[PDB]
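Example 3.
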Amino acid sequence: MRRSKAEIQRYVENAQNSASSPREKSMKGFLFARLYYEAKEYELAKRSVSSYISVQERDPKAHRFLGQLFEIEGNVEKAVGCYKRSLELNPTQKDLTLRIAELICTLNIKDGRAEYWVERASKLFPGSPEIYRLKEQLLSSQGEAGWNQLFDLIQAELFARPNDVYVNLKLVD
Amino acid sequence: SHEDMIHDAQMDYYGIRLATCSSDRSVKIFDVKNGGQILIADLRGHDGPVWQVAWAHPMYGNILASCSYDRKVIIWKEENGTWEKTYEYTGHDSSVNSVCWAPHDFGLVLACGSSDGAISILTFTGDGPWEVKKISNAHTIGCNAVSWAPSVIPGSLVDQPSSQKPNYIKRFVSGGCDNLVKIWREEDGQWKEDQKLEAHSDWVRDVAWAPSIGLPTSTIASCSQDGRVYIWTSDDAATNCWTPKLLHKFNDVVWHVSWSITANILAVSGGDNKVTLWKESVDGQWACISDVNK
């Protein structure tokens, strides 16, 4: 994808020429946010996201896009809030919970709510070595209450299918 | 005038009379000419806040119906530009909510939907008395809304665009607060169990049938109390297959969902102060074009 400053500028101008209505431009803001994010315009991307919400609020796709943008930026709290809003709106995609658990594991939070969220994400996705290592580190930093849930999840995974070499190594460690 | 809140405000089929039913204890109908307005009718006979309203066709009889928070059904008839008394019913388990007539393809059968636990259908036959159809043990908590369904929709029966006249029998849907949706069809000379479904465990606000004038696809867009929406689509023959699919969900209190007069634009009104006006595009999908503020 050959993209540059002038390339994003002419993309934006061509998208503006492809819309002769303010509400149509606001609806096309889900792409304008990505264009501004690529051109390094976080405030303009947030404004485009708000404009697209003002015309089509309460939708899982827009909330997931906003959460992904916040996660790539660094606003972990904003991403967690957006994912929670998307979950309370319609918990159809477990990717929101997966990213919430990933952010919690990267932030290292010792709390019962964090442990419950990690357990829920593990029950959702039993695979993925990245999230496995994340939840293992989290439940090891926790204590015995988290180690019991980790052992239960490992036993359930082993009963469902043969475990992995790294999984067995981490369990023995 | 209308100093208090205004509920529904319908217009005549030609664009002259404007019937606005509000809670201001006054129903004023003005005129539409030269962009102005002149008061021409002042009706008042309810005991509580007036809610919904529905018009009719002058070829079958200029008759209006008004529901209020008093368990009373009020009906007026138009003669020489003056509306007088017609049919006045009173007494129910709860206050009447929804009220609408069947389309012109059937007749002038009124539907009464309220959280009373039963269904009371009023049928206007002849030029005087009426008939009452009572259906009990059909709602645990009660009804909520009733949306009629014409037989001129090719999406229900694949035999209309073939020089064949379909049956003109009564068919509609219902989605009360009994955690169950249901379909009603006038078969075996009465009403019984046709098709029920379970898709919620609380309250459901209203529903909207698509009055397609040339679209061979029958759709129904629902709206619940917790922002839940269901789009039941059908395009088969004889028996239909309602698919409980989802579209744009909400978390507030979605209230009304209304289809256009020719099944072109859907208007959804709830607690977001925005009425998303959807429309079927040429690619067989949905797209929103215009909005409005509340």
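The CA atoms of residues 82 and 240 of chain B lie 44 Å apart. DSSP finds no helices and 23 strands in chain B.
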